[PDB]
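Recall from the previous lesson that a structure prediction takes nothing but the amino acid sequence as input. Here we apply that procedure to high-affinity branched chain amino acid transport atp-binding protein from Methanocaldococcus jannaschii. The sequence below is the only information supplied.
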Amino acid sequence: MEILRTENIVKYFGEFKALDGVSISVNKGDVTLIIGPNGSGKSTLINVITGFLKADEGRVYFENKDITNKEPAELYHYGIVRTFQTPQPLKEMTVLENLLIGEINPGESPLNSLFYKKWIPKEEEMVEKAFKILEFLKLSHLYDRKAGELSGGQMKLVEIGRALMTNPKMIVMDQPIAGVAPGLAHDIFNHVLELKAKGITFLIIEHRLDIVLNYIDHLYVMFNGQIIAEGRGEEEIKNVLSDPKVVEIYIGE
Ligand SMILES: [Cl-]
Ligand SMILES: [Cl-]
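The prediction returns the following tokens.
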């Protein structure tokens, strides 16, 4: 049931301690969200897990396999992928190409994958997969469209599509719907549930709780680098959100 766990993960940035012995467990097929005020190490944590950051101490286990500090190219073979915010160079490219760059160095980010330049492979095999995904996402009609011309929610959906290009078992997303209009937002998360349905596990960071909350089935709250609250399920979550210590981290300067 548990697909991912971290055992006392530590990360340092100089002398500052961004993370502080963070341990978390995530069950297969779950949609796990982590929240906390800016500066709590949510991102750093996510980056460590996805392999874009090195864990100074502690470990990460995927399906009970020690994967600590493996490069994203390697984690790709394990079924882990992170969604990447789209850079400007990619915005000049079509929606199809944006899914296609996920093929060059599977698991690696768009720019560490675009080291290959205009060599965005347009090989029949990959493209068919890109379309199959654009299809599932109900975006094939925008396959030829320059990504920079899409709405924020549209762009977010494309990024999810770029990740699916790696047939992941788990998708890690840092703020999938920030700046996305409510209707498109629920739609994005709708597709997540659609994916949860096929057995895909999610680890998400978000700040707009007024939308997201109805979709997550595992919450974690973080402050100063450590897990300061957990709550599995609707009821526990309502409690977690009620708890005054949580509200307080958001008030007082
Ligand atoms: Cl590092
Ligand atoms: Cl927002």
